[PDB]
Design a protein around this nucleic acid. Structure first.
Ligand code: YAT
Ligand code: MG
Ligand code: MG
Ligand code: MG
Ligand code: MG
Ligand code: MG
Length: 81
RNA sequence: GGGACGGGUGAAACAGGAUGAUCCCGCCGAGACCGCCGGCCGCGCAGGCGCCUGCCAAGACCGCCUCUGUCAAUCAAGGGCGAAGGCCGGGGGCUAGAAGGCGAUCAGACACCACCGUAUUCCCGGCCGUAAACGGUGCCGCCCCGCGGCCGGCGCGCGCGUCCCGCCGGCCGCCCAGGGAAACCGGGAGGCUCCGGGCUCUGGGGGGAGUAUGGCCGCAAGGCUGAAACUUGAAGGCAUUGACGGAGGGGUACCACCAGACGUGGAGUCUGCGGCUCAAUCUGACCCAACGCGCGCACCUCACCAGGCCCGGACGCGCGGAGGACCGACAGCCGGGCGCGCUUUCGCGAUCGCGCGGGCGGUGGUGCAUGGCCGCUCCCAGCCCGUGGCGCGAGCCGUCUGCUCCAUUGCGACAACGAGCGAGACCCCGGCCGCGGGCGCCGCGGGACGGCCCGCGCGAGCGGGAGGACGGCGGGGCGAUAGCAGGUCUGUGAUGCCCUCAGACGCCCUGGGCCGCACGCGCGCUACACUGGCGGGGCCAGCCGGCGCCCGCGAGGACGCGCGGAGCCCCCGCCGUGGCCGGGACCGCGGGCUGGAACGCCCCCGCGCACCAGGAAUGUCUUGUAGGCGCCCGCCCCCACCGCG
């Protein structure tokens, strides 16, 4: 399914922003575990967790290949010079 | 010259062609016209103005230390010009073309389309004197934010280019203020309720009516001037939201189509529906959004028809009542039958009776008085809030003239910012795996997410390929705001207002009807046969589920115990294109079941209607789908061609 409601996008974002180092760009199992983790957030369902994780993956690689709008990745370091 | 069609239309048909058409070339004649350049260019009082050459007069503007000295502005009466069409008298006669004719189209078409064609269109002389003759805005005059284009003339500066800086006049575009009902104007429609520069003309709700009667002009057609009676409560202007469009641009769906399949409409029958009938054949619903639907009519159900018992009249006031209120019965008749009623004669005892008030009940009416529940708009994707801003205001922005999505699903912008519902998310079912448990396979979890590769695309996301039980909304449920005079008072101790209320529409019994049939159609069933019918045999389902022995051909029956699954299909044979062994409607004896009671339902023998694939018309459908085959439940004393599965 190609439906991506707002909730998925906003949640996947806040999650990537608040938690990068613990993750990888193309994985789906590590990202799924990170989402399932309690500190990061809470997902009542399973299908929701899977969808959010997938969107997290696609955002993460879209970022790692190149900086992405709306993402507070903490990248001033390389440009604050 | 050459040899067969040409013309014309959406498609055709009238007219032309072996008398040589259409087609190519050349020549001849006449009369109209003045193209591409041609324009937010220009000229003219307006109407209007475009070939070469030449002639005649005229005009605004610019430049000027040239002349005069108020000679000016606007205007009834009066005068002149005045598109096209039209008229009088003469010319000329190619195009087009009122009238007229003819061919199509149409229900008709004397109209739109095709073809032929008169006046007219052209010139001279003269009448007419009207146009959305529009900038729908009178003439003269002053002030007025800013930017820009073009035309003509003049001047300034320089690095001399047809440069850039200005002046006058003219034609235009945008626009700050300001104005206005607003659209809009802004080279005023500004400087005006803070309401006075000068001159002229017109109007006073809509029709009657620019009509009648007079007058003037005109050959005429007609023009200028121009009432009343009567009638009427609105007619109009600018703008807003919806609905509609034989309007445009994007999208979408087997209740749309393409490609195909299976059908219906043809016959007989089941069932419901209108009509006809009867004593009654009780009713509701009429495009999708009524017509096997309001869950199986011998009695009840049941409302309708013909007839009969009962009060089951609560509760308060007056009266009477045990010196007897009210209620039952043997026998005999009449009555379908009953002590219903009739002829006597016995019984019981205040549980009351009569009049007045007031109840209860009713498948009685109004669904256009209502609640609730359904259907439809809607097999959609849309709907609203707070702050702020634009408008006098109804209203608008937010809520998208971009790209994607099945989807107001998302990316990216924007006088908008920030939220919510709906959508998705969610719940049930199934497919693969793990753990546990177990009379009987049933409890908890995992797993799939546009995740991986490749292309593109800023992106959202699109196309392909993999591995995987399953690959991109697998099937159902729930279902936004707003609304319909949709259906239901015949579902109810849900109901407002009317009408029934002791010879009752109350309640109970006996029969009958709802099924009656010259007729039109809606959902279905069975068949038209060899891809078949008949006989014997073998054999596998799931929602789920009860069997033995003995009689009887069978249907069924008498006993006694707890135990259990089919059609198609496959195999061997008969038939052999004949309305034949296809098809089994209709009808005639008989044996049984249900039930108080067959009109209902099964079995046996016999008889053996149409029907040879069904016209105009029309329905449904994309994987375990269509179609074919059968099996269980609902209602039900018996009964499924129905419906949910
Ligand atoms: C009801 C009269 C109309 C129908 N007819 C005959 C059938 C026909 C068939 C056509 O091709 C499909 C056709 O082309 C469009 C025209 C016709 C005529 C046309 C009649 C109507 C006519 N006037 C109104 C609209 C119209 C539009 C047309 O389209 C341009 C047209 O074609 C020339 C003719 C017409
Ligand atoms: Mg003329
Ligand atoms: Mg005028
Ligand atoms: Mg005034
Ligand atoms: Mg007035
Ligand atoms: Mg008037």
């Amino acid at each position: 399914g190609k439906v991506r409601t707002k909730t998925i996008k906003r949640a996947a974002r806040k999650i990537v922003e608040n938690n990068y180092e613990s993750l990888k760009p193309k994985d789906f199992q590590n990202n799924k575990a990170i989402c399932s983790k309690r500190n990061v957030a809470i997902i009542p369902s399973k299908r929701l967790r899977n969808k959010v994780a997938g969107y997290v993956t696609t955002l993460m690689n879209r970022v790692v290949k190149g900086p992405v709008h709306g993402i507070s990745l903490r990248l001033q370091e390389e440009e604050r010079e």
